Amino acid sequence: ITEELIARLKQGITSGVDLQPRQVNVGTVIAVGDGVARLSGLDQVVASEIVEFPPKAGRNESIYGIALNLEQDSVAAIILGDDETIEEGDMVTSTGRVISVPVGQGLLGRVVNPLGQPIDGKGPIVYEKTRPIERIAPGVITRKSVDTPVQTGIIAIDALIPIGRGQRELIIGDRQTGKTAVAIDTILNQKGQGMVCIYVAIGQRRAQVAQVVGTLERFGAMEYTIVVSATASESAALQYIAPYAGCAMGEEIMENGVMLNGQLVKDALIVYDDLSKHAVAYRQVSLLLRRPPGREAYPGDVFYLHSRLLERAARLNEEYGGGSLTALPVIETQANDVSAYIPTNVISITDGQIYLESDLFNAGQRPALNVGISVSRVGGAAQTRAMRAVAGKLKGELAQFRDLAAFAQFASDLDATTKAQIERGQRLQELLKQPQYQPLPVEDQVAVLYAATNNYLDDVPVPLITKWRDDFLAFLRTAHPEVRKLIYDNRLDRKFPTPEVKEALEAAIKEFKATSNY
Amino acid sequence: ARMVAMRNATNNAKDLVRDLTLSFNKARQAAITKEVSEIASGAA
Amino acid sequence: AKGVIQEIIGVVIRAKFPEDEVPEIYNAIEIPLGNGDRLVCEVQQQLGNGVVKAVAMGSTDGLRRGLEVIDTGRPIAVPVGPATLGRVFNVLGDPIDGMGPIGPEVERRPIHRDPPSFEEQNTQAQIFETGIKVIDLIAPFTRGGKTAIFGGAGVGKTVVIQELIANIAKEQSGFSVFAGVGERSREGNDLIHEMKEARIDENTTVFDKTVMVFGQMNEPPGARLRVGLTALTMAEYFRDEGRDILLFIDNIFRFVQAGSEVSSLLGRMPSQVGYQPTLGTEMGELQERITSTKRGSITSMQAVYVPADDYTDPAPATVFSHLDATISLERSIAERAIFPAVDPLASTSRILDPNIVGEEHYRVAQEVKRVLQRYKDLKDIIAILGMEELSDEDKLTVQRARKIELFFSQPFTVAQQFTGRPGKYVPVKKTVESFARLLNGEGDHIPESFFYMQGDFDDVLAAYEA
Amino acid sequence: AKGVIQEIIGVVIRAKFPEDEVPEIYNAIEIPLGNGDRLVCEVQQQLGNGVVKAVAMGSTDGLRRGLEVIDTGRPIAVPVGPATLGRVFNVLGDPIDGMGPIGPEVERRPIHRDPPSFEEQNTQAQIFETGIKVIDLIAPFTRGGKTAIFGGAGVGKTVVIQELIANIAKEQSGFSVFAGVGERSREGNDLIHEMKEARIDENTTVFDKTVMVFGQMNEPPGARLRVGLTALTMAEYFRDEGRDILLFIDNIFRFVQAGSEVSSLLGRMPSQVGYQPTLGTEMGELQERITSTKRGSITSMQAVYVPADDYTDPAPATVFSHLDATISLERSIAERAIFPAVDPLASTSRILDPNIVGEEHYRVAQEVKRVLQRYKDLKDIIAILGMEELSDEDKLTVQRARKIELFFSQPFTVAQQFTGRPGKYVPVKKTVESFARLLNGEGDHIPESFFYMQGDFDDVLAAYEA
Numbered sequence A: 001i002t003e004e005l006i007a008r009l010k011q012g013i014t015s016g017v018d019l020q021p022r023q024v025n026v027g028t029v030i031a032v033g034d035g036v037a038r039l040s041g042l043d044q045v046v047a048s049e050i051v052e053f054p055p056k057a058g059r060n061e062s063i064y065g066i067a068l069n070l071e072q073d074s075v076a077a078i079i080l081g082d083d084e085t086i087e088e089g090d091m092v093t094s095t096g097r098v099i100s101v102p103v104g105q106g107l108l109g110r111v112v113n114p115l116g117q118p119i120d121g122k123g124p125i126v127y128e129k130t131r132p133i134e135r136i137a138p139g140v141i142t143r144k145s146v147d148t149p150v151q152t153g154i155i156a157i158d159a160l161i162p163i164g165r166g167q168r169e170l171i172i173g174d175r176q177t178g179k180t181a182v183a184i185d186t187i188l189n190q191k192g193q194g195m196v197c198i199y200v201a202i203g204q205r206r207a208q209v210a211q212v213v214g215t216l217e218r219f220g221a222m223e224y225t226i227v228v229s230a231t232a233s234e235s236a237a238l239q240y241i242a243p244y245a246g247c248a249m250g251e252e253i254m255e256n257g258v259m260l261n262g263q264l265v266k267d268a269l270i271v272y273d274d275l276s277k278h279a280v281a282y283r284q285v286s287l288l289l290r291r292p293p294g295r296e297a298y299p300g301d302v303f304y305l306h307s308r309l310l311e312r313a314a315r316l317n318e319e320y321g322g323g324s325l326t327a328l329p330v331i332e333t334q335a336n337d338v339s340a341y342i343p344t345n346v347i348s349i350t351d352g353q354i355y356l357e358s359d360l361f362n363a364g365q366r367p368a369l370n371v372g373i374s375v376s377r378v379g380g381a382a383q384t385r386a387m388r389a390v391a392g393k394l395k396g397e398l399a400q401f402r403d404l405a406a407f408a409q410f411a412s413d414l415d416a417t418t419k420a421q422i423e424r425g426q427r428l429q430e431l432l433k434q435p436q437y438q439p440l441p442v443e444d445q446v447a448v449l450y451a452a453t454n455n456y457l458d459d460v461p462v463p464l465i466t467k468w469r470d471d472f473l474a475f476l477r478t479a480h481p482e483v484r485k486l487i488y489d490n491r492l493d494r495k496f497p498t499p500e501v502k503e504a505l506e507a508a509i510k511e512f513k514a515t516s517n518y
Numbered sequence B: 001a002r003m004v005a006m007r008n009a010t011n012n013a014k015d016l017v018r019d020l021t022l023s024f025n026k027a028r029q030a031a032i033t034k035e036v037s038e039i040a041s042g043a044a
Numbered sequence C, D: 001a002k003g004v005i006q007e008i009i010g011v012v013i014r015a016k017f018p019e020d021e022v023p024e025i026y027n028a029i030e031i032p033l034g035n036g037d038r039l040v041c042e043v044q045q046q047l048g049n050g051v052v053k054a055v056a057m058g059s060t061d062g063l064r065r066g067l068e069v070i071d072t073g074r075p076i077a078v079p080v081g082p083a084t085l086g087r088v089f090n091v092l093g094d095p096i097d098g099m100g101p102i103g104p105e106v107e108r109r110p111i112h113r114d115p116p117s118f119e120e121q122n123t124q125a126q127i128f129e130t131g132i133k134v135i136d137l138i139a140p141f142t143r144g145g146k147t148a149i150f151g152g153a154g155v156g157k158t159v160v161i162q163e164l165i166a167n168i169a170k171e172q173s174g175f176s177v178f179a180g181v182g183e184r185s186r187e188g189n190d191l192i193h194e195m196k197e198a199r200i201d202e203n204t205t206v207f208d209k210t211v212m213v214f215g216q217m218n219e220p221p222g223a224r225l226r227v228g229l230t231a232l233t234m235a236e237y238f239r240d241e242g243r244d245i246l247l248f249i250d251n252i253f254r255f256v257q258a259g260s261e262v263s264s265l266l267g268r269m270p271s272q273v274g275y276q277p278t279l280g281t282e283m284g285e286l287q288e289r290i291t292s293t294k295r296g297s298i299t300s301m302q303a304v305y306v307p308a309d310d311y312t313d314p315a316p317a318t319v320f321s322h323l324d325a326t327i328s329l330e331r332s333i334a335e336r337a338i339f340p341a342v343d344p345l346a347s348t349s350r351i352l353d354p355n356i357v358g359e360e361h362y363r364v365a366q367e368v369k370r371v372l373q374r375y376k377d378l379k380d381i382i383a384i385l386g387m388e389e390l391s392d393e394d395k396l397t398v399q400r401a402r403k404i405e406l407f408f409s410q411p412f413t414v415a416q417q418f419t420g421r422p423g424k425y426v427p428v429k430k431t432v433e434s435f436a437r438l439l440n441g442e443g444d445h446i447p448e449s450f451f452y453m454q455g456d457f458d459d460v461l462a463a464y465e466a
């Protein structure tokens, strides 16, 4: 039926175009700075349009720019591409659209620019809907209390610092501590939990983003992950708009959803890999625009900058779709300077913090969480009833050990109860230690924590506790596959240690301990 | 006697920590003031 | 009116007007957004020939220079009246809840009022009776006076807020205003909505007795700066009717931070540690309309976040300069199930002097703190050697101090449905008598239990007999 | 294409060009001097009407306000090729060594180039085989990765550089580049030139296999800013051929400092502590060209000088944001005749995880640095207990720690003609096997000083048998 093509054509050709010449308003570049153009008299430009810089002699492409400053008789446009080509006298055209990014099912497993242009070299993006960057937060009455848990896969986070769908948990740490490692472990653990992870990679090296994408592809997590990337070499405009593009891509998932594994997934998880670098990029943009600085030279609206970005992460109620968008901002502090400007801003914005300390990271506690200061204001509402019922004693014993943490090397010359508390705390801390790219499912964590809180690892020496776990779960993975399913089935039961699962788990633990020697 | 001496030393160390915290906070405020003053001077 | 946008730099915009009819400062100019919605910008400076510099208070991302601007001729008009009760508003007065518009029949007042004159101020300070034993004894409120609460929000601060609202509603005229300055959309808006709608008192929910104004995080710095003034404007209508109002401002430090951000955006020179030069003046524009006048009184409790841990930082210092009482919620007191987790030693109040609360109130409060302070000193020693080494009388003070700190617990009417225990309103005189009779020796034979979550001493005895 | 100088303020030159022939943003200005040579500037800001603000790259102590300037159209063009090998160059690519100028036939490449795209980046990190036991075990490099030494003078850093060059030139093709950015002319020159010319391998001097570009502290800030990019271009030429390149940017921090000055003189608004607003982007444009593509890899081992001892400072933090490994040279290890002064502790590398290096490599690298995790904390106990005469089992741990500390030392080929000991190249597999077998206890039969300067455990055994 080519006649259908001939009929659809030859009709819009004849009467689908005005073809009427008209005066259009353009602008002349009058000063090119360190990535900033002034554009002279380009009227009818919206406060955040994406100007075009049409091709000229010696340039067969177009570099786009954002018209951030609409001054009088001048429009300071931040350049998204490379500024080395735009010269004084160049013509600019004001595309009437605020920056928009493609969204939908098409952008799964693809690495894209903050402008939605693919950079993985696997073909053009297939899409039919573009969502605008910089949209208003969902609203007050549009949300619901966070109840569904986001299974990180790390015992420490998933047991003591719960993350729920719609909760904004901050991963704050000092330089090389494992923030990207924690984010990647969280992303890898959503294989069958019906969630679409997003990784933004603001200001990271191209090599690091490439290795992250390789890790995600190697574990098969690049079939539900969207990777945005504005690397260090790219202009400050791309780093400035990267998290907003990522969260627009995530808002499409939250509101409309995508077909993941033949199921309508409306939950999304987004990881802003460095808001400490996004803030630096925005500071560079502001200072090159000669906007008045503030504390630490950051512009006045830098709290607003991250606030817009993070306040779009919400748990919508059933009326608006029931979707979600979990945000995991990442911050690199300097010498644990929590009182710094950007860390304090994002800490006040977010609903929780995961403090990763270099001291614990170097000591040997490789997941370097500091449970004493790390909080999750959602708390138990972001945990399954099984984990909520089991982790209370874990948290209590860990707190008691922390109160006696100065005493570990003097454990022998202490009270029997104090020595027992110290020993239990050491065992629990060794239990929380976890390798990389080995997330534990919820049933495995529940089983291990039930074995630990109850006096079952007391006979196992501390240096082998980790090994014990790495064996016990394997035992449950092979010898007793039914107990894991039994735990997972009634993980939502109000009284989780129901007699059936209690006897099953007790028998499994006793059978494992009897055979093994430690 | 060692227990009493260490109790007194711990109390003295806590008092010294409080004094040093006050001094550190004063220095932190002074550093922030100096930084913003010089940044505003460079801008103007 | 009918100006045109001349400059758009972030939130800070500039609007050119005719040589006449230039808007005044704080005049809330309005930009049509191409539809029914509009962008309200507050004029902060007048420049040259008709140009006015204003703060956006909105997205300001879809605007173009040359767009029409309309002068309202007055500061931000906020609806006031009984219609605001049971409704949730933003800084601009637009209701952000599900219910529809307020309506033109309801009176609208300017956001920027003036504090009551010198004549209208009360000569003497009157104690505000909240009804909570620890609050009314250790750190008593002041009618028309500011109050600060220190907590990590995981220690039942919202429970205390709801209890105060319910107490004033049931035993006074009872209208309250909650200003969520810098309030998170999830943690601070929907959670508090559900808590206030679920919490009920004498067949009326707490939400029906309060007016909630939310300047959220995602709003620009001007909105978070003026949300407190919107809340004061809303509460001043009820104050002018002779009623007594409780104003709960969450994280006034976020109001300070919004002011600092606005000053930085406007280009003003920075002062001290990244603070606005107009810090004292801005804190005086607020918290000065919170006074006990002849007609009525507005008493405010304001959560205060301390930057780092500095009580000498300019923002908490300026807040403290306007405070009459401080309540220090502490985590350990709440880990043990003492829900009114007010730390008596840390929490203080100005009105706790003999000439106002009475000699008997002052004497018992000091003795309560004295034995508690002795207990805090012996907390080390008890862990050092055991309770045995402690001398007698000191052993009594430890035993008595534990009983009194357990007695600081009190059932709440807003927590009746959660805990299945009726709330107990303990008057200040009853609290003073009960604690004096606890200290003098009565109830010593009673164990530590039977003091937990009780009302007066009469409740502690009646329970012991039964 | 000829303009006239307008203003001269220090090393910042403003030049007005014709309206239609304004130079680009990174072109060279090339001011001609009377005495035959020229002053090559670099544009930094197009502004005004044909006016460009540029950085001098030179003294500018003999220039008027009317001198002509000849735009070169292209950015600073630097000679690249096999000809530019074993020669010393300045920022402009002019050979500053005694030998003659580079011939016109040699290809000139722009100093500013686009770093490799994301598609070309390796999807899996790969270890870089240096041959040094302590480096290849404790802090393995990365193919196309960055490593920083934190060491002063007299710790053998120069000898480490020479051996790295020699090893890469022997095992691989391994041409090397050395950019001394803001170095002392005494240390950087005539103590690197002479030591590398004297150092020899396979009858070829190290200097013959190494390119040198030197922007020293005496040169203006622009020269120290662009010397790194000059070295990157020279290395990228060889990388395009597929050959592996090792690049040493000595005092990369002095690069950052240079940029700061370039910004301060350019009128840019200061950021943080006086540093340039374009700090992250400027560092990225230099650290992103150092990566491992499919054709070849530019591995970099830089040197970082932290002002005072502040790692919180913006320049060290920005440097560390682009670092893959840290090698901590120490005075104590160097003065103990341990020729490689690399500290087993305080030397980290993100490659040291079982997924990349391997489970056995990670296991042994954790087994070592664990007996030293305490840094033999027993040494404190030995000081006031004398080992309590002997430790129950600790005394063994001390013996193993001393043996492995001695074993970290390795005879270097570049020092073979100084200490009269043949150089030993140790593969990473040999290193891991040797250290694992030593930790099992095979090394509990040989005394100390038998591990003093030997390449493999097998080499230690041969010595014990003989």
Ligand SMILES: Nc1ncnc2c1ncn2[C@@H]1O[C@H](COP(=O)(O)OP(=O)(O)OP(=O)(O)O)[C@@H](O)[C@H]1O
Pocket (backbone or CB within 6 Å): A173, A174, A175, A176, A177, A178, A179, A180, A181, A182, A332, A366, A367, A434, A435, A436, A437, D349, D350, D351, D352, D353
């Ligand atoms: N959970 C973990 N298990 C094992 N190794 C880990 C873990 N977390 C971190 N590491 C090790 O630490 C290295 C650095 O971790 P990672 O890259 O996640 O840190 P980061 O905080 O994101 O640092 P950066 O500031 O460099 O981006 C990893 O390459 C790995 O070798």
Ligand SMILES: [Mg+2]
Pocket (backbone or CB within 6 Å): A179, A180, A181
């Ligand atoms: Mg990281």
